[PDB]
């Protein structure tokens, strides 16, 4: 219930060769402020679809 011969580096990253990540690739902008915010979230300053709804 343990290893029996040492895995190499070449068998190591080939388990990691699916372990990459995918960042965002979209990042829409605001109708009023034109600020970068996540798709279907709200802005850092608080807009969504041309509506200030943070109440800040």
Partner 1 sequence: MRHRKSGRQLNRNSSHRQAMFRNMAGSLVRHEIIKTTLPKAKELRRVVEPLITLAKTDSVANRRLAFARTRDNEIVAKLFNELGPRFASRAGGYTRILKCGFRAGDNAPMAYIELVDRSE
Partner RNA sequence: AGGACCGAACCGACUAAUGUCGAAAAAUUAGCGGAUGACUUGUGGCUGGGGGUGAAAGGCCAAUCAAACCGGGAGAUAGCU
Partner RNA sequence: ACACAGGUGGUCAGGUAGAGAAUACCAAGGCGCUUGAGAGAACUCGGGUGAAGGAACUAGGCAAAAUGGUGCCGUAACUUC
Partner RNA sequence: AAUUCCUUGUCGGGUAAGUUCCGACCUGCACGAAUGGCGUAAUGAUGGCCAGGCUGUCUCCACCCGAGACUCAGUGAAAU
Partner RNA sequence: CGAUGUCGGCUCAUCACAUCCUGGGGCUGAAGUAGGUCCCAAGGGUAUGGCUGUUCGCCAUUUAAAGUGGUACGCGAGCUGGGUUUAGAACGUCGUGAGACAGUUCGGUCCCUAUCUGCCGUGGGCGCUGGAGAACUGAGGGGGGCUGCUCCUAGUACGAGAGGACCGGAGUGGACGCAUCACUGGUGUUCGGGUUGUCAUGCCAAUGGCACUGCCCGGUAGCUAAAUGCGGAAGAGAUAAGUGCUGAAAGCAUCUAAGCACGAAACUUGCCCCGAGAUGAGUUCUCCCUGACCCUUUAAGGGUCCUGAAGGAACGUUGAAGACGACGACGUUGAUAGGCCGGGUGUGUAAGCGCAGCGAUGCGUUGAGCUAACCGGUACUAAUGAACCGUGAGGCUUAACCU
Among 9, 16, 39, 56, binds RNA (CB under 7 A): 39
Among 13, 27, 44, 45, binds RNA (CB under 7 A): 27
Residue 54 within binding range of RNA, rule CB under 7 A: no
- The residue among 5, 18, 37 whose CA lies nearest residue 48 is 37
Number of other residues whose CB lies within 10 A of the CB of residue 2? 3
Residue 41 within binding range of partner 1, rule CB under 8 A: yes
Residue 55 within binding range of partner 1, rule CB under 8 A: yes
């Amino acid at each position: 219930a343990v290893q029996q011969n040492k895995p190499t580096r070449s068998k190591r990253g080939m388990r990691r060769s699916h372990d990459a990540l995918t960042a965002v690739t979209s990042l829409s902008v605001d109708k009023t402020s034109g600020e970068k915010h996540l798709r279907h979230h709200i802005t850092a300053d608080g807009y969504y679809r041309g509506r200030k709804v943070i109440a800040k």
